[PDB]
Protein backbone atom coordinates (compact mmCIF):
# COMPACT_ATOMS: atom_id res chain seq x y z
CA UNK A 1 0.00 0.00 0.00
CA UNK A 2 1.04 3.64 -0.53
CA UNK A 3 -0.09 6.49 1.76
CA UNK A 4 -1.72 9.65 0.55
CA UNK A 5 -4.39 12.16 1.49
CA UNK A 6 -6.98 14.64 0.25
CA UNK A 7 -7.80 18.27 0.94
CA UNK A 8 -10.23 21.01 0.00
CA UNK A 9 -10.73 24.69 0.81
CA UNK A 10 -11.70 23.53 4.32
CA UNK A 11 -7.95 23.14 5.05
CA UNK A 12 -6.15 26.48 5.47
CA UNK A 13 -2.67 24.93 5.63
CA UNK A 14 -0.81 22.17 3.78
CA UNK A 15 3.00 21.96 3.94
CA UNK A 16 3.71 19.51 1.14
CA UNK A 17 7.41 19.14 1.99
CA UNK A 18 6.29 17.97 5.45
CA UNK A 19 3.69 15.67 3.86
CA UNK A 20 6.32 14.09 1.60
CA UNK A 21 8.61 13.62 4.65
CA UNK A 22 5.68 11.88 6.40
CA UNK A 23 5.73 9.33 3.56
CA UNK A 24 2.67 10.53 1.67
CA UNK A 25 3.03 10.19 -2.10
CA UNK A 26 -0.30 11.26 -3.62
CA UNK A 27 -2.98 13.84 -2.92
CA UNK A 28 -6.47 14.56 -4.24
CA UNK A 29 -7.57 18.19 -4.17
CA UNK A 30 -11.10 19.58 -4.48
CA UNK A 31 -11.52 21.57 -7.70
CA UNK A 32 -15.23 22.04 -8.41
CA UNK A 33 -18.79 21.46 -7.29
CA UNK A 34 -21.84 21.66 -9.49
CA UNK A 35 -21.38 24.13 -12.36
CA UNK A 36 -20.79 27.31 -10.20
CA UNK A 37 -18.19 26.45 -7.49
CA UNK A 38 -14.43 26.49 -8.01
CA UNK A 39 -12.40 26.06 -4.82
CA UNK A 40 -10.36 29.20 -4.11
CA UNK A 41 -7.69 26.95 -2.50
CA UNK A 42 -7.24 24.63 -5.50
CA UNK A 43 -4.44 26.52 -7.26
CA UNK A 44 -2.28 26.98 -4.10
CA UNK A 45 -2.79 23.32 -3.20
CA UNK A 46 -2.21 21.83 -6.66
CA UNK A 47 0.91 23.98 -7.16
CA UNK A 48 2.28 23.05 -3.73
CA UNK A 49 1.73 19.36 -4.48
CA UNK A 50 3.46 19.70 -7.86
CA UNK A 51 6.49 21.54 -6.41
CA UNK A 52 7.03 18.97 -3.63
CA UNK A 53 7.13 15.74 -5.60
CA UNK A 54 3.52 14.60 -5.28
CA UNK A 55 1.41 12.62 -7.66
CA UNK A 56 -1.84 14.63 -7.58
CA UNK A 57 -5.35 14.77 -8.89
CA UNK A 58 -8.49 16.84 -8.61
CA UNK A 59 -12.02 15.94 -7.54
CA UNK A 60 -15.52 17.21 -8.33
CA UNK A 61 -18.42 17.22 -5.86
CA UNK A 62 -21.41 15.97 -7.84
CA UNK A 63 -24.75 17.81 -7.70
CA UNK A 64 -26.96 15.44 -9.72
CA UNK A 65 -30.18 17.47 -9.46
CA UNK A 66 -28.58 20.78 -10.50
CA UNK A 67 -27.45 20.05 -14.08
CA UNK A 68 -26.46 17.19 -16.33
CA UNK A 69 -23.51 14.92 -15.71
CA UNK A 70 -22.00 16.14 -19.01
CA UNK A 71 -22.23 19.79 -17.92
CA UNK A 72 -20.46 19.00 -14.65
CA UNK A 73 -17.77 16.93 -16.38
CA UNK A 74 -17.07 19.86 -18.73
CA UNK A 75 -16.94 22.32 -15.82
CA UNK A 76 -14.61 20.04 -13.83
CA UNK A 77 -12.28 19.29 -16.77
CA UNK A 78 -12.00 23.04 -17.55
CA UNK A 79 -11.37 24.11 -13.94
CA UNK A 80 -8.79 21.75 -12.46
CA UNK A 81 -9.78 18.26 -13.57
CA UNK A 82 -7.69 18.32 -16.75
CA UNK A 83 -5.23 15.48 -17.20
CA UNK A 84 -1.82 15.13 -18.85
CA UNK A 85 0.40 12.07 -19.31
CA UNK A 86 3.32 13.37 -17.19
CA UNK A 87 3.39 10.49 -14.68
CA UNK A 88 2.21 12.73 -11.86
CA UNK A 89 -1.44 13.50 -12.73
CA UNK A 90 -4.12 11.18 -11.45
CA UNK A 91 -7.38 10.91 -13.38
CA UNK A 92 -9.96 13.25 -11.87
CA UNK A 93 -12.35 11.83 -9.29
CA UNK A 94 -16.14 12.10 -9.19
CA UNK A 95 -17.18 12.55 -5.52
CA UNK A 96 -20.71 11.15 -5.69
CA UNK A 97 -22.19 10.86 -2.22
CA UNK A 98 -24.89 12.01 0.23
CA UNK A 99 -26.69 15.22 -0.70
CA UNK A 100 -25.18 17.78 1.62
CA UNK A 101 -28.44 20.11 1.26
CA UNK A 102 -31.35 17.59 1.40
CA UNK A 103 -32.45 14.07 0.64
CA UNK A 104 -29.53 11.74 0.16
CA UNK A 105 -30.26 10.59 -3.45
CA UNK A 106 -31.01 14.17 -4.66
CA UNK A 107 -34.56 13.22 -5.75
CA UNK A 108 -33.30 11.04 -8.61
CA UNK A 109 -34.45 7.47 -9.18
CA UNK A 110 -31.70 4.83 -9.08
CA UNK A 111 -31.71 4.39 -12.84
CA UNK A 112 -31.71 8.17 -13.39
CA UNK A 113 -28.71 8.41 -11.05
CA UNK A 114 -26.87 5.68 -13.00
CA UNK A 115 -27.59 7.60 -16.21
CA UNK A 116 -26.28 10.84 -14.66
CA UNK A 117 -23.04 9.16 -13.56
CA UNK A 118 -22.71 7.55 -17.02
CA UNK A 119 -23.07 10.97 -18.62
CA UNK A 120 -20.36 12.41 -16.34
CA UNK A 121 -17.86 9.61 -16.83
CA UNK A 122 -18.40 9.26 -20.62
CA UNK A 123 -18.08 13.04 -21.04
CA UNK A 124 -15.00 13.26 -18.82
CA UNK A 125 -13.34 10.43 -20.80
CA UNK A 126 -14.20 12.09 -24.12
CA UNK A 127 -12.60 15.33 -22.96
CA UNK A 128 -9.52 14.08 -21.14
CA UNK A 129 -8.95 10.52 -22.46
CA UNK A 130 -9.34 9.16 -18.92
CA UNK A 131 -12.09 7.33 -17.11
CA UNK A 132 -12.55 9.15 -13.79
CA UNK A 133 -12.13 7.62 -10.37
CA UNK A 134 -15.43 7.24 -8.48
CA UNK A 135 -15.41 8.26 -4.80
CA UNK A 136 -18.42 6.98 -2.89
CA UNK A 137 -19.57 4.84 0.02
CA UNK A 138 -21.09 1.39 -0.28
CA UNK A 139 -24.23 2.42 1.59
CA UNK A 140 -24.83 5.55 -0.53
CA UNK A 141 -24.12 3.63 -3.73
CA UNK A 142 -26.56 0.88 -2.72
CA UNK A 143 -29.42 3.22 -1.92
CA UNK A 144 -28.94 5.72 -4.71
CA UNK A 145 -27.80 3.57 -7.68
CA UNK A 146 -29.37 0.22 -6.75
CA UNK A 147 -25.80 -0.98 -6.16
CA UNK A 148 -24.95 -0.65 -9.85
CA UNK A 149 -22.01 -2.57 -11.34
CA UNK A 150 -22.02 -0.40 -14.49
CA UNK A 151 -18.83 1.58 -13.84
CA UNK A 152 -16.49 -0.93 -12.19
CA UNK A 153 -14.72 -2.04 -15.41
CA UNK A 154 -13.86 1.54 -16.34
CA UNK A 155 -13.66 3.66 -13.18
CA UNK A 156 -11.24 2.89 -10.35
CA UNK A 157 -12.96 2.89 -6.94
CA UNK A 158 -12.11 5.35 -4.17
CA UNK A 159 -14.12 3.96 -1.25
CA UNK A 160 -14.70 5.76 2.04
CA UNK A 161 -15.06 3.91 5.36
CA UNK A 162 -13.43 5.14 8.58
CA UNK A 163 -12.90 1.75 10.20
CA UNK A 164 -10.19 -0.81 10.86
CA UNK A 165 -10.93 -2.56 7.54
CA UNK A 166 -12.30 -1.39 4.20
CA UNK A 167 -15.50 -3.37 4.45
CA UNK A 168 -17.79 -4.51 1.68
CA UNK A 169 -17.27 -2.82 -1.71
CA UNK A 170 -20.02 -1.71 -4.07
CA UNK A 171 -21.20 -4.24 -6.63
CA UNK A 172 -18.86 -4.85 -9.55
CA UNK A 173 -15.55 -3.86 -7.98
CA UNK A 174 -13.24 -6.68 -6.97
CA UNK A 175 -10.90 -4.31 -5.14
CA UNK A 176 -10.51 -0.71 -4.09
CA UNK A 177 -7.97 1.53 -5.82
CA UNK A 178 -8.04 4.12 -3.03
CA UNK A 179 -9.51 3.76 0.48
CA UNK A 180 -10.28 6.88 2.52
CA UNK A 181 -9.85 5.48 6.03
CA UNK A 182 -9.98 8.58 8.26
CA UNK A 183 -10.75 12.30 8.26
CA UNK A 184 -7.72 13.02 10.45
CA UNK A 185 -4.78 13.79 8.17
CA UNK A 186 -2.26 15.41 10.59
CA UNK A 187 -2.22 18.76 8.77
CA UNK A 188 -5.98 18.66 8.11
CA UNK A 189 -7.85 16.61 5.51
CA UNK A 190 -8.54 12.95 4.95
CA UNK A 191 -6.16 9.99 4.81
CA UNK A 192 -6.06 7.47 1.95
CA UNK A 193 -4.38 4.22 1.00
CA UNK A 194 -3.55 3.36 -2.59
CA UNK A 195 -3.91 -0.40 -3.18
CA UNK A 196 -0.70 -1.12 -5.03
CA UNK A 197 2.98 -0.41 -5.41
CA UNK A 198 4.81 2.57 -6.86
CA UNK A 199 4.80 1.12 -10.38
CA UNK A 200 1.05 0.69 -10.25
CA UNK A 201 0.46 4.22 -8.93
CA UNK A 202 2.55 5.56 -11.80
CA UNK A 203 0.55 3.37 -14.23
CA UNK A 204 -2.70 4.86 -12.90
CA UNK A 205 -1.29 8.35 -13.41
CA UNK A 206 -0.10 7.42 -16.92
CA UNK A 207 -3.29 5.64 -17.85
CA UNK A 208 -1.66 2.52 -19.01
Residue numbers in the entry: 1 to 208
The authors write:
Muramidases (N-acetylmuramide glycanhydrolases), also known as lysozymes, cleave the bacterial cell wall peptidoglycan component at the β-1,4-glycosidic bond between N-acetylmuramic acid (NAM) and N-acetylglucosamine (NAG) in the carbohydrate backbone. The characterized enzymes from GH25 exhibit both β-1,4-N-acetyl- and β-1,4-N,6-O-diacetylmuramidase activities, cleaving the β-1,4-glycosidic bond between N-acetylmuramic acid (NAM) and N-acetylglucosamine (NAG) moieties in the carbohydrate backbone of bacterial peptidoglycan. It is proposed that, as previously suggested for other GH25 muramidases, that Asp95 acts as an acid donating a proton to the glycosidic oxygen of the substrate, with the N-acetyl group of the substrate rather than a second protein carboxylate acting as the enzymatic nucleophile to stabilise the oxocarbenium ion-like transition state.
The enzyme from Acremonium alcalophilum JCM 7366 (A. alcalophilum is now known as Sodiomyces alcalophilus (G. Okada) Giraldo López & Crous, but we will use the AaMur abbreviation for the muramidase in this paper) finally proved to be the muramidase of choice. For AaMur, there was a single molecule in the asymmetric unit and the whole chain was modelled, with only the terminal residues Arg1 and Asp208 being rather poorly defined. The catalytic residues in the conserved GH25 DXE motif are Asp95 and Glu97. A strong H-bond is shown between the catalytic acid Asp95 and its conserved supporting residue Glu97. The high quality of the structure at 0.78Å is evident from the weighted map and in the difference map there are positive density peaks for a good number of the hydrogen atoms. TzMur, Zopfiella sp. t180-6 and Ascobolus stictoideus had Tm above 60°C at both pH 3 and 5. The melting temperature of AaMur as a function of pH using three different buffers is shown in Table 5, establishing that it retained its stability over a range of pH. The optimum is at pH 4.0, but the activity profiles are quite broad, especially for AaMur.
